[PDB]
Amino acid sequence: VSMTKTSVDCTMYICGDSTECSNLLLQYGSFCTQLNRALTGIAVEQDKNTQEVFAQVKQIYKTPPIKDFGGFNFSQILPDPSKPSKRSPIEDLLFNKVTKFNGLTVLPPLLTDEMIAQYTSALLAGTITSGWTFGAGPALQIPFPMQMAYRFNGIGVTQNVLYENQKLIANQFNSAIGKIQDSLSSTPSALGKLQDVVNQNAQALNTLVKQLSSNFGAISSVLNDILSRLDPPEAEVQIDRLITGRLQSLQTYVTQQLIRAAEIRASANLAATKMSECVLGQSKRVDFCGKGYHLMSFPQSAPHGVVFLHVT
Amino acid sequence: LIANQFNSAIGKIQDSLSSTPSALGKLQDVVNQNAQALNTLVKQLSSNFGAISSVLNDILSRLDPPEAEVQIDRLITGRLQSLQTYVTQQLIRAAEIRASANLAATKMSECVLGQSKRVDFCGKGYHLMSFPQSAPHGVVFLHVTYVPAQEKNFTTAPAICHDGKAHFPREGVFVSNGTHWFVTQRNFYEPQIITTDNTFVSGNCDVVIGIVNNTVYDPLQPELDS
Amino acid sequence: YSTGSNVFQTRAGCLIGAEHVNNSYECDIPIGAGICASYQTSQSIIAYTMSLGAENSVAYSNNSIAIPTNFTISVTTEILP
Ligand SMILES: *[C@@H]1O[C@H](CO)[C@@H](O)[C@H](O)[C@H]1NC(C)=O
Ligand SMILES: *[C@@H]1O[C@H](CO)[C@@H](O)[C@H](O)[C@H]1NC(C)=O
Numbered sequence: 001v002s003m004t005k006t007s008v009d010c011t012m013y014i015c016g017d018s019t020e021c022s023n024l025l026l027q028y029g030s031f032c033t034q035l036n037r038a039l040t041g042i043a044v045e046q047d048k049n050t051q052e053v054f055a056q057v058k059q060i061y062k063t064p065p066i067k068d069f070g071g072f073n074f075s076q077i078l079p080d081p082s083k084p085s086k087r088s089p090i091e092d093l094l095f096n097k098v099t100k101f102n103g104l105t106v107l108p109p110l111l112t113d114e115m116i117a118q119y120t121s122a123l124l125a126g127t128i129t130s131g132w133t134f135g136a137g138p139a140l141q142i143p144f145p146m147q148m149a150y151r152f153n154g155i156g157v158t159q160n161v162l163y164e165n166q167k168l169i170a171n172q173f174n175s176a177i178g179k180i181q182d183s184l185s186s187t188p189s190a191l192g193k194l195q196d197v198v199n200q201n202a203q204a205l206n207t208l209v210k211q212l213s214s215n216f217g218a219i220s221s222v223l224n225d226i227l228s229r230l231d232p233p234e235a236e237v238q239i240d241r242l243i244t245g246r247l248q249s250l251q252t253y254v255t256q257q258l259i260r261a262a263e264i265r266a267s268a269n270l271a272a273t274k275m276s277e278c279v280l281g282q283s284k285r286v287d288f289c290g291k292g293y294h295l296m297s298f299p300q301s302a303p304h305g306v307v308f309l310h311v312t
Numbered sequence: 313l314i315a316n317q318f319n320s321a322i323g324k325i326q327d328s329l330s331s332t333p334s335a336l337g338k339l340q341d342v343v344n345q346n347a348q349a350l351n352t353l354v355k356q357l358s359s360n361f362g363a364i365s366s367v368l369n370d371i372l373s374r375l376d377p378p379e380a381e382v383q384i385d386r387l388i389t390g391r392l393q394s395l396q397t398y399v400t401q402q403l404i405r406a407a408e409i410r411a412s413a414n415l416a417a418t419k420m421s422e423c424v425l426g427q428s429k430r431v432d433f434c435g436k437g438y439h440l441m442s443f444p445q446s447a448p449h450g451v452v453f454l455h456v457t458y459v460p461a462q463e464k465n466f467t468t469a470p471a472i473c474h475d476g477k478a479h480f481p482r483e484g485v486f487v488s489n490g491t492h493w494f495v496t497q498r499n500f501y502e503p504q505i506i507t508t509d510n511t512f513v514s515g516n517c518d519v520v521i522g523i524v525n526n527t528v529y530d531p532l533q534p535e536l537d538s
Numbered sequence: 539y540s541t542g543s544n545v546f547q548t549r550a551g552c553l554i555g556a557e558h559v560n561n562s563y564e565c566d567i568p569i570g571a572g573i574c575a576s577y578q579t580s581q582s583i584i585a586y587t588m589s590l591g592a593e594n595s596v597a598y599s600n601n602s603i604a605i606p607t608n609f610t611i612s613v614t615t616e617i618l619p
């Protein structure tokens with residue numbers, strides 16, 4: 001849904017504290033402002049991006065104190081008050097599974113992880129107690145067996161199936177939730193997409209930092225070493241070569257980051273619409289909310305992403 | 313009532329668009345971003361890029377061709393870098409606009425060319441219609457949506473035990489105001505007496521949990537009696 | 539900064555010139571880490587934790603259905619480049 005809101009500081013990166021380097025960089029007029037504006041735009045759209053995915057709901061709903069949903073067990077998916085941070089056990093599994101400054105800086109996300117968990121809990125409690133009504137308008141209470149009868153009637157199976165196999169279906173749903181928890185706990189590459197996003201961003205930052213050590217054809221890769229031991233008339237050309245190299249590197253970093261931000265924006269627009277058509281309501285869109293005839297969905301926050309439990 | 317509500321909603325849309333200055337945020341932002349890109353591209357000429365001056369005529373005069381070549385080459389490298397940056401940012405933004413306008417085209421197709429059951433796609437709420445309205449470098453949709461308003465909460469039961477056989481609603485749910493049980497459609501309170509027409513029998517009393525006892529009126533019974 | 543009388547500290551950074559408020563309202567000017575600054579009433583800039591919305595507890599029950607009685611045909615503007 002998002003990635004780290006890095007904001008590389010243009011002048012502090014391309015040049016050190018040296019004033020000569022900044023004076024030379026001033027000749028390259030607005031490359032530097034373009035790069036800074038592009039990175040701030042990326043960060044702003046990541047904030048808007050998480051807000052669009054998760055803030056699908058207006059009221060923060062809370063589940064009733066007593067969990068009597070006709071046999072359906074949501075304990076593995078609703079927040080656990082015992083834990084300090086109000087996260088579901090599956091959310092805890094996801095957060096555990098998913099795992100200095102040269103001018104760089106990472107801006108904190110606008111919505112903290114606790115607030116995102118509060119949004120997901122609101123969506124989940126609204127789903128459990130109301131259905132699609134809480135997204136189609138005001139929230140309307142409905143017993144959960146009645147809501148599943150609604151969903152079965154949605155997939156073309158008459159209600160008598162649910163009201164006559166309620167115990168069996170409740171046990172199957174509970175066992176399926178448990179198996180999801182176990183598979184997430186066991187398989188280490190389950191969180192592949194989020195882990196890959198984080199790793200790609202970290203690799204991009206590390207390559208950007210490593211680019212400082214490159215000589216780029218100059219005598220040395222240290223501005224102080226260039227200023228000392230060399231007088232200004234060719235110190236200018238050495239610094240200019242180094243500036244060209246470092247600015248090319250920063251342009252490459254921001255262009256790759258713009259590509260990846262567009263990719264994440266597409267993925268998170270898909271996440272937002274998947275939220276809207278799967279958890280905010282039942283989807284007849286084939287093979288969109290999980291393989292099979294779709295019944296429900298449950299958002300679960302994950303670090304820089306979202307995880308859905310497509311009950312099919 | 314619905315005609316008056318629709319007319320009032322249209323009027324309120326006109327008033328909100330007229331009053332709020334940042335309503336057209338997306339289109340205004342696209343235009344501003346393009347204008348800023350062009351202005352930065354133009355300003356890039358004034359940059360020396362490490363050369364003696366930012367004017368080709370000033371470089372050509374006052375300097376003989378031997379080092380005029382290298383000065384012009386430095387200026388060319390700078391300006392070509394600026395132009396590549398502009399066109400790459402424009403390719404990014406054009407891909408973003410292409411995605412937005414593919415979304416606009418499909419929103420047209422599923423919202424105004426037909427009604428969409430795709431939740432929260434054509435406006436928040438149950439969707440009814442949509443109306444395209446052209447805007448400078450964009451499109452504006454007026455998603456006419458249906459939103460329930462006045463809740464009344466009743467006591468519900470999954471089924472009904474008429475003669476030992478469960479009765480389930482064909483369309484809608486079972487509700488009761490406290491004494492009498494009614495079947496009603498889900499999105500509107502239209503209570504109406506339980507009858508074999510709107511309830512299909514399926515199964516037995518004991519299997520269902522939450523089934524409540526009641527009678528289900530038989531429309532053919534008075535016809536037989538008469 | 540000159541206005542050193544109130545110097546609030548948050549995860550985003552050192553916020554100078556705005557006083558912290560226990561109460562939580564909607565976000566006006568986002569700061570970061572769940573804190574949004576705003577201008578409210580004797581006027582000053584206030585920094586506070588965001589309020590995600592009016593916490594509404596749906597009166598869920600075993601046999602309680604809520605069915606609407608009328609509607610509101612509401613048209614909403616969607617703008618796309
Ligand atoms: C409707 O809900 C309220 C609480 O929100 C409750 O007090 C009331 O009894 C409910 N209506 C009926 C008919 O039970
Ligand atoms: C319930 O509605 C029926 C028909 O509308 C009416 O005869 C009855 O008196 C009502 N009872 C209550 C308690 O509202």
Ligand SMILES: *[C@@H]1O[C@H](CO)[C@@H](O)[C@H](O)[C@H]1NC(C)=O
Nearest residue numbers: 068143521522523599600601
């Ligand atoms: C709901 O719970 C009450 C007691 O809390 C119980 O009497 C009732 O039977 C339950 N509902 C159903 C449908 O069993």
Ligand SMILES: *[C@@H]1O[C@H](CO)[C@@H](O)[C@H](O)[C@H]1NC(C)=O
Nearest residue numbers: 473476517522523524525526
């Ligand atoms: C419905 O009537 C039957 C008739 O014997 C009775 O056994 C059953 O307990 C009744 N159900 C309820 C919920 O009162």
Ligand SMILES: *[C@@H]1O[C@H](CO)[C@@H](O)[C@H](O)[C@H]1NC(C)=O
Nearest residue numbers: 544546556557558559560561
């Ligand atoms: C907010 O709460 C704190 C307690 O942590 C207390 O000082 C006061 O009520 C509020 N703080 C300020 C600065 O008003």
Ligand SMILES: *[C@@H]1O[C@H](CO)[C@@H](O)[C@H](O)[C@H]1NC(C)=O
Nearest residue numbers: 313317461462607608609610
């Ligand atoms: C629904 O709203 C309309 C207009 O506001 C009005 O008829 C009344 O308030 C409601 N209709 C009912 C209760 O039948």
